[PDB]
Amino acid sequence: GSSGSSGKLYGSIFTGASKFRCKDCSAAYDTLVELTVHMNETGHYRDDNHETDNNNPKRWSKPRKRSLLEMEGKEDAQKVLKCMYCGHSFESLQDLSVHMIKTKHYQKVSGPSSG
Ligand SMILES: [Zn+2]
Ligand SMILES: [Zn+2]
């Protein structure tokens, strides 16, 4: 005699994804430009959440609140050229400019920080 059987192997893995999907029917697509066409052609529409409502009957917890402090800085309403570094009123621009350089005050007008 001589007879027998064998062969036990597997391999039926399924791999497939879809970008967009139709609610009405089960027809999915990859590009929106393709789906839309169907949504109108046939009439169906997307499934993704829909925001066709604004009235929120759901009460919300206490409202929001924040402190609105207030303060001013180095304000000076003058009418004459005056260096903020040293503090010497002038008559003409040059006097001021030629000074900012001759003294290099415009280069050093600040430094560290407090808060
Ligand atoms: Zn459809
Ligand atoms: Zn100066």
Side-chain angles (χ1 to χ4, degrees), residues 5-70:
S5 307
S6 80
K8 287 184 81 71
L9 189 76
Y10 271 81
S12 205
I13 56 91
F14 298 91
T15 55
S18 67
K19 311 302 207 59
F20 309 86
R21 309 87 75 200
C22 182
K23 211 210 155 74
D24 291 40
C25 70
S26 288
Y29 299 101
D30 296 33
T31 58
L32 176 66
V33 55
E34 270 205 72
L35 167 74
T36 53
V37 171
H38 161 78
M39 307 210 261
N40 288 274
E41 269 180 334
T42 68
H44 307 185
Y45 273 117
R46 54 210 206 200
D47 91 273
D48 317 64
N49 202 288
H50 267 272
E51 40 172 73
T52 313
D53 176 73
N54 175 45
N55 153 79
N56 55 0
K58 43 261 288 285
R59 206 170 192 193
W60 68 96
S61 299
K62 270 84 164 88
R64 181 155 73 83
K65 60 155 276 275
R66 63 156 168 159
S67 277
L68 280 287
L69 27 47
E70 283 201 80

Coordinates of all heavy atoms in Angstrom, one line a residue, residues 5-70:
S5 N -1.6 12.1 3.2 CA -1.8 13.6 2.9 C -1.1 14.4 3.9 O -0.8 14.0 5.0 CB -3.3 13.8 2.9 OG -4.0 13.0 2.1
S6 N -0.8 15.7 3.5 CA -0.1 16.6 4.4 C -0.1 18.0 3.8 O -0.5 18.2 2.7 CB 1.4 16.1 4.7 OG 2.2 16.5 3.6
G7 N 0.4 19.0 4.6 CA 0.5 20.3 4.1 C -0.3 21.3 5.0 O -1.5 21.6 4.7
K8 N 0.3 21.7 6.1 CA -0.4 22.6 7.1 C 0.4 24.0 7.1 O 1.2 24.2 7.9 CB -0.4 22.0 8.5 CG -1.4 20.9 8.6 CD -1.5 20.4 10.0 CE -2.4 21.2 10.9 NZ -3.8 21.1 10.5
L9 N 0.0 24.9 6.2 CA 0.6 26.2 6.2 C -0.5 27.3 6.1 O -1.6 27.1 5.6 CB 1.5 26.3 5.0 CG 2.4 27.6 4.9 CD1 3.6 27.4 5.8 CD2 2.9 27.8 3.5
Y10 N -0.1 28.4 6.7 CA -1.1 29.6 6.7 C -0.5 30.8 6.0 O 0.7 30.8 5.6 CB -1.4 29.9 8.2 CG -2.6 29.2 8.7 CD1 -2.5 27.9 9.2 CD2 -3.9 29.8 8.7 CE1 -3.6 27.2 9.6 CE2 -5.0 29.1 9.2 CZ -4.8 27.8 9.7 OH -5.9 27.1 10.1
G11 N -1.3 31.8 5.8 CA -0.8 33.0 5.2 C -1.9 33.8 4.4 O -1.9 33.9 3.2
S12 N -2.9 34.2 5.2 CA -4.1 35.0 4.6 C -4.3 36.3 5.3 O -5.4 36.7 5.5 CB -5.3 34.1 4.7 OG -6.3 34.5 3.7
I13 N -3.1 36.9 5.7 CA -3.2 38.2 6.4 C -3.9 39.3 5.5 O -3.6 39.4 4.3 CB -1.8 38.7 6.8 CG1 -0.9 38.8 5.5 CG2 -1.2 37.8 7.8 CD1 -0.9 40.1 4.8
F14 N -4.7 40.1 6.1 CA -5.4 41.2 5.3 C -4.9 42.5 5.7 O -4.8 42.9 6.9 CB -6.9 41.1 5.6 CG -7.6 39.8 5.2 CD1 -7.7 38.8 6.1 CD2 -8.1 39.7 3.9 CE1 -8.3 37.6 5.7 CE2 -8.7 38.5 3.6 CZ -8.8 37.5 4.4
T15 N -4.5 43.3 4.7 CA -3.9 44.6 4.9 C -4.6 45.6 3.9 O -4.3 45.6 2.7 CB -2.4 44.6 4.6 OG1 -2.1 44.1 3.3 CG2 -1.7 43.8 5.7
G16 N -5.4 46.5 4.5 CA -6.1 47.5 3.7 C -6.6 48.6 4.5 O -7.3 48.4 5.5
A17 N -6.4 49.9 4.1 CA -6.9 51.0 4.8 C -7.6 52.0 3.9 O -7.5 51.9 2.6 CB -5.7 51.8 5.5
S18 N -8.4 52.9 4.4 CA -9.2 53.9 3.7 C -9.1 55.2 4.3 O -9.4 55.4 5.5 CB -10.6 53.4 3.5 OG -11.3 53.4 4.7
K19 N -8.8 56.3 3.5 CA -8.8 57.6 4.0 C -10.2 58.1 4.4 O -10.5 58.4 5.5 CB -8.1 58.5 3.0 CG -6.8 58.0 2.4 CD -5.8 57.8 3.5 CE -4.4 57.9 2.9 NZ -4.1 59.2 2.3
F20 N -11.0 58.3 3.4 CA -12.4 58.7 3.6 C -13.4 57.6 3.5 O -13.1 56.6 2.9 CB -12.7 59.8 2.6 CG -11.7 60.9 2.6 CD1 -10.6 60.8 1.7 CD2 -11.9 62.1 3.3 CE1 -9.7 61.9 1.7 CE2 -10.9 63.1 3.3 CZ -9.8 63.0 2.5
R21 N -14.6 57.8 4.0 CA -15.6 56.8 3.9 C -17.0 57.4 3.8 O -17.2 58.5 4.3 CB -15.6 55.9 5.2 CG -14.2 55.3 5.5 CD -13.4 56.3 6.3 NE -13.8 56.3 7.7 CZ -13.5 57.3 8.6 NH1 -12.8 58.3 8.2 NH2 -14.0 57.2 9.8
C22 N -17.9 56.7 3.2 CA -19.3 57.2 3.0 C -20.2 56.7 4.1 O -20.2 55.5 4.4 CB -19.8 56.9 1.6 SG -21.5 57.5 1.3
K23 N -21.1 57.5 4.6 CA -22.0 57.1 5.6 C -23.1 56.2 5.1 O -23.3 55.1 5.4 CB -22.7 58.3 6.3 CG -23.0 58.1 7.8 CD -24.2 59.0 8.2 CE -25.0 58.4 9.3 NZ -24.2 58.5 10.6
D24 N -23.9 56.8 4.1 CA -25.0 56.1 3.5 C -24.5 54.7 3.1 O -24.9 53.7 3.7 CB -25.4 56.8 2.2 CG -26.2 58.1 2.6 OD1 -25.7 58.8 3.5 OD2 -27.2 58.4 1.9
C25 N -23.7 54.5 2.1 CA -23.2 53.3 1.6 C -21.8 52.9 2.3 O -21.3 53.7 3.0 CB -23.1 53.2 0.1 SG -21.7 54.3 -0.5
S26 N -21.3 51.8 1.9 CA -20.0 51.3 2.5 C -18.9 51.5 1.5 O -18.0 50.6 1.3 CB -20.1 49.9 3.0 OG -20.9 49.7 4.1
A27 N -19.0 52.6 0.7 CA -18.0 52.9 -0.3 C -16.9 53.9 0.2 O -17.2 55.1 0.4 CB -18.6 53.4 -1.6
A28 N -15.7 53.4 0.5 CA -14.6 54.3 0.9 C -13.7 54.7 -0.2 O -13.7 54.1 -1.3 CB -13.8 53.5 2.0
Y29 N -13.1 55.8 0.0 CA -12.2 56.4 -1.0 C -10.8 56.8 -0.4 O -10.7 56.8 0.8 CB -12.8 57.6 -1.7 CG -14.1 57.3 -2.4 CD1 -15.4 57.5 -1.8 CD2 -14.1 56.6 -3.7 CE1 -16.5 57.2 -2.5 CE2 -15.3 56.3 -4.3 CZ -16.5 56.6 -3.7 OH -17.7 56.3 -4.4
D30 N -9.9 57.2 -1.3 CA -8.6 57.6 -0.8 C -8.5 59.1 -0.9 O -7.9 59.8 0.1 CB -7.5 57.0 -1.7 CG -7.5 55.5 -1.6 OD1 -8.5 54.9 -1.4 OD2 -6.4 54.9 -1.7
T31 N -9.0 59.7 -1.9 CA -8.9 61.2 -2.1 C -10.3 61.8 -1.9 O -11.3 61.3 -2.4 CB -8.3 61.6 -3.5 OG1 -9.1 61.0 -4.5 CG2 -6.9 61.1 -3.6
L32 N -10.3 62.9 -1.2 CA -11.6 63.6 -0.9 C -12.3 64.0 -2.3 O -13.5 63.9 -2.4 CB -11.4 64.9 -0.1 CG -12.6 65.7 0.2 CD1 -13.6 65.0 1.0 CD2 -12.2 67.0 0.8
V33 N -11.4 64.5 -3.2 CA -12.0 64.9 -4.5 C -12.8 63.8 -5.2 O -13.6 64.1 -6.0 CB -10.8 65.3 -5.5 CG1 -9.8 64.2 -5.6 CG2 -11.3 65.7 -6.8
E34 N -12.5 62.5 -4.8 CA -13.2 61.4 -5.3 C -14.5 61.1 -4.6 O -15.5 60.8 -5.1 CB -12.3 60.2 -5.3 CG -11.5 60.0 -6.5 CD -11.1 58.5 -6.8 OE1 -11.9 57.7 -7.1 OE2 -9.9 58.2 -6.6
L35 N -14.4 61.3 -3.2 CA -15.6 61.1 -2.4 C -16.7 62.1 -2.7 O -17.8 61.7 -3.0 CB -15.2 61.1 -0.9 CG -16.3 61.2 0.1 CD1 -17.0 59.9 0.2 CD2 -15.8 61.7 1.4
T36 N -16.3 63.4 -2.6 CA -17.3 64.4 -2.8 C -18.1 64.1 -4.0 O -19.3 64.2 -4.0 CB -16.6 65.8 -3.0 OG1 -15.5 65.7 -4.0 CG2 -16.0 66.2 -1.7
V37 N -17.4 63.8 -5.1 CA -18.1 63.5 -6.4 C -19.3 62.5 -6.2 O -20.3 62.7 -6.7 CB -17.1 62.9 -7.4 CG1 -17.9 62.4 -8.7 CG2 -16.1 64.0 -7.8
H38 N -19.0 61.5 -5.4 CA -20.0 60.5 -5.1 C -21.1 61.1 -4.2 O -22.3 60.8 -4.4 CB -19.4 59.3 -4.4 CG -20.4 58.4 -3.7 ND1 -21.2 57.5 -4.3 CD2 -20.6 58.3 -2.4 CE1 -22.0 56.9 -3.4 NE2 -21.6 57.4 -2.2
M39 N -20.7 61.8 -3.2 CA -21.6 62.4 -2.2 C -22.7 63.3 -3.0 O -23.9 63.3 -2.6 CB -20.9 63.3 -1.2 CG -19.7 62.6 -0.5 SD -19.5 63.3 1.1 CE -18.1 64.4 0.8
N40 N -22.3 63.9 -4.1 CA -23.2 64.7 -4.9 C -23.8 63.9 -6.0 O -25.1 63.9 -6.2 CB -22.5 65.9 -5.5 CG -22.1 67.0 -4.4 OD1 -22.9 67.8 -4.1 ND2 -20.9 66.9 -3.9
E41 N -23.0 63.1 -6.7 CA -23.5 62.3 -7.8 C -24.7 61.5 -7.3 O -25.8 61.5 -7.9 CB -22.4 61.4 -8.3 CG -21.6 62.0 -9.4 CD -20.5 61.1 -9.9 OE1 -20.0 60.2 -9.1 OE2 -20.1 61.2 -11.1
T42 N -24.5 60.7 -6.3 CA -25.6 59.8 -5.7 C -26.4 60.6 -4.7 O -27.6 60.5 -4.7 CB -25.0 58.6 -5.1 OG1 -24.3 58.9 -3.9 CG2 -24.1 57.8 -6.0
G43 N -25.8 61.4 -3.9 CA -26.5 62.2 -2.9 C -25.9 61.9 -1.5 O -26.0 62.8 -0.6
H44 N -25.4 60.8 -1.2 CA -24.8 60.4 0.1 C -23.9 61.5 0.6 O -23.7 62.5 -0.1 CB -24.0 59.1 0.0 CG -24.8 58.0 -0.6 ND1 -24.3 56.7 -0.7 CD2 -26.0 57.9 -1.2 CE1 -25.2 55.9 -1.3 NE2 -26.2 56.6 -1.5
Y45 N -23.4 61.4 1.8 CA -22.5 62.4 2.4 C -21.5 61.7 3.3 O -21.6 60.6 3.7 CB -23.4 63.4 3.2 CG -23.9 64.6 2.3 CD1 -25.2 64.8 2.1 CD2 -23.0 65.4 1.7 CE1 -25.7 65.8 1.4 CE2 -23.4 66.5 0.9 CZ -24.8 66.7 0.7 OH -25.3 67.7 0.0
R46 N -20.5 62.5 3.7 CA -19.5 62.0 4.6 C -20.1 61.5 5.9 O -21.3 61.6 6.2 CB -18.5 63.1 4.9 CG -19.1 64.4 5.5 CD -18.3 65.6 5.0 NE -18.4 66.7 6.0 CZ -18.1 68.0 5.7 NH1 -17.7 68.3 4.5 NH2 -18.3 68.9 6.6
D47 N -19.2 61.0 6.8 CA -19.7 60.5 8.1 C -19.1 61.3 9.2 O -19.7 61.5 10.3 CB -19.3 59.0 8.2 CG -17.9 58.8 8.9 OD1 -16.9 58.8 8.2 OD2 -17.9 58.7 10.1
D48 N -17.9 61.7 9.1 CA -17.2 62.5 10.1 C -18.2 63.4 10.8 O -19.1 63.9 10.2 CB -16.1 63.4 9.4 CG -15.3 62.6 8.4 OD1 -15.8 62.2 7.4 OD2 -14.1 62.4 8.7
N49 N -17.9 63.6 12.1 CA -18.8 64.5 12.9 C -19.3 65.7 12.1 O -18.6 66.2 11.2 CB -18.0 65.0 14.2 CG -19.0 65.4 15.3 OD1 -19.6 66.4 15.2 ND2 -19.0 64.5 16.3
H50 N -20.5 66.1 12.4 CA -21.1 67.3 11.8 C -21.4 68.4 12.8 O -22.0 68.1 13.8 CB -22.3 66.8 11.0 CG -22.1 66.5 9.6 ND1 -22.1 67.4 8.6 CD2 -21.8 65.3 9.0 CE1 -21.9 66.7 7.4 NE2 -21.7 65.5 7.7
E51 N -21.0 69.6 12.4 CA -21.3 70.8 13.3 C -22.4 71.6 12.7 O -22.1 72.8 12.3 CB -20.0 71.6 13.4 CG -19.2 71.7 12.2 CD -18.0 72.7 12.3 OE1 -17.0 72.3 13.0 OE2 -18.1 73.8 11.8
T52 N -23.6 71.1 12.7 CA -24.8 71.8 12.2 C -25.6 72.4 13.3 O -26.8 72.5 13.2 CB -25.6 71.0 11.2 OG1 -24.8 70.3 10.3 CG2 -26.6 71.8 10.5
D53 N -25.0 72.7 14.4 CA -25.7 73.2 15.6 C -24.8 74.1 16.4 O -23.7 73.8 16.6 CB -26.2 72.1 16.5 CG -26.9 72.5 17.7 OD1 -28.1 73.1 17.6 OD2 -26.3 72.4 18.8
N54 N -25.4 75.2 16.9 CA -24.7 76.2 17.7 C -25.3 76.3 19.1 O -24.5 76.3 20.1 CB -24.7 77.6 17.0 CG -24.1 78.6 17.9 OD1 -23.0 78.4 18.5 ND2 -24.7 79.8 18.0
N55 N -26.6 76.3 19.2 CA -27.3 76.4 20.5 C -26.8 75.3 21.4 O -27.1 74.1 21.2 CB -28.8 76.4 20.3 CG -29.5 75.8 21.5 OD1 -29.7 76.5 22.5 ND2 -29.9 74.6 21.4
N56 N -26.1 75.7 22.5 CA -25.7 74.7 23.4 C -26.5 74.7 24.7 O -26.4 75.5 25.6 CB -24.2 75.0 23.8 CG -24.0 76.4 24.3 OD1 -25.0 77.2 24.4 ND2 -22.8 76.7 24.7
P57 N -27.5 73.8 24.7 CA -28.4 73.6 25.9 C -27.7 73.1 27.1 O -28.3 73.1 28.2 CB -29.4 72.6 25.4 CG -28.7 71.8 24.4 CD -27.8 72.8 23.7
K58 N -26.4 72.8 27.0 CA -25.6 72.3 28.1 C -25.0 73.4 28.9 O -24.2 74.2 28.4 CB -24.5 71.3 27.6 CG -23.8 71.8 26.4 CD -24.4 71.2 25.1 CE -23.9 69.7 25.0 NZ -22.5 69.6 24.6
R59 N -25.4 73.6 30.2 CA -24.9 74.6 31.0 C -23.4 74.4 31.3 O -23.0 73.3 31.5 CB -25.7 74.6 32.3 CG -25.7 76.0 33.0 CD -26.7 76.1 34.2 NE -26.9 77.4 34.6 CZ -27.5 77.7 35.8 NH1 -28.0 76.7 36.6 NH2 -27.7 79.0 36.1
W60 N -22.7 75.5 31.3 CA -21.3 75.5 31.5 C -20.9 76.0 32.9 O -21.6 76.9 33.5 CB -20.5 76.3 30.5 CG -20.8 77.8 30.6 CD1 -20.0 78.7 31.3 CD2 -21.9 78.5 30.1 NE1 -20.5 79.9 31.2 CE2 -21.7 79.9 30.4 CE3 -23.0 78.2 29.3 CZ2 -22.6 80.9 30.1 CZ3 -23.9 79.2 28.9 CH2 -23.7 80.5 29.3
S61 N -19.9 75.5 33.5 CA -19.4 75.8 34.9 C -19.2 77.4 34.9 O -19.4 78.1 34.0 CB -18.2 75.1 35.3 OG -18.4 73.7 35.3
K62 N -18.8 77.8 36.1 CA -18.5 79.2 36.3 C -17.7 79.8 35.1 O -16.9 79.1 34.4 CB -17.6 79.4 37.6 CG -18.5 79.7 38.8 CD -19.0 78.4 39.4 CE -19.5 78.5 40.8 NZ -20.9 78.9 40.9
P63 N -17.9 81.1 34.8 CA -17.3 81.8 33.7 C -15.8 82.0 33.9 O -15.3 81.7 35.0 CB -18.0 83.1 33.7 CG -18.5 83.4 35.0 CD -18.8 82.0 35.6
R64 N -15.1 82.6 33.0 CA -13.7 82.8 33.1 C -13.4 84.2 33.6 O -14.2 85.1 33.5 CB -13.0 82.7 31.7 CG -11.5 82.9 31.7 CD -10.8 82.3 30.5 NE -11.1 82.9 29.3 CZ -10.4 84.0 28.9 NH1 -9.4 84.5 29.6 NH2 -10.7 84.6 27.7
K65 N -12.3 84.4 34.3 CA -11.9 85.6 34.9 C -10.4 85.8 35.0 O -9.7 84.8 35.3 CB -12.5 85.8 36.3 CG -12.1 84.7 37.3 CD -12.2 85.1 38.7 CE -11.0 85.9 39.2 NZ -9.9 85.0 39.6
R66 N -9.9 87.0 34.9 CA -8.5 87.3 34.9 C -8.2 88.7 35.4 O -9.0 89.6 35.2 CB -7.9 87.1 33.6 CG -8.4 88.0 32.5 CD -7.4 88.2 31.4 NE -7.9 88.9 30.2 CZ -7.2 89.6 29.3 NH1 -5.9 89.6 29.4 NH2 -7.8 90.2 28.3
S67 N -7.1 88.8 36.1 CA -6.7 90.2 36.6 C -6.2 91.1 35.5 O -5.4 90.6 34.7 CB -5.7 90.0 37.7 OG -6.3 89.7 39.0
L68 N -6.5 92.3 35.6 CA -6.1 93.3 34.6 C -5.3 94.4 35.2 O -5.8 95.6 35.3 CB -7.3 93.9 33.8 CG -7.8 93.0 32.7 CD1 -6.9 93.0 31.5 CD2 -8.1 91.6 33.2
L69 N -4.1 94.1 35.7 CA -3.2 95.1 36.4 C -3.1 96.4 35.5 O -3.7 96.4 34.4 CB -1.9 94.5 36.6 CG -1.4 93.4 35.7 CD1 -1.7 93.8 34.2 CD2 0.1 93.1 35.9
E70 N -2.4 97.3 36.0 CA -2.2 98.6 35.3 C -1.1 99.4 35.9 O -0.9 99.5 37.1 CB -3.5 99.4 35.4 CG -4.6 99.0 34.4 CD -5.6 100.0 34.1 OE1 -5.3 100.9 33.2 OE2 -6.7 100.0 34.7

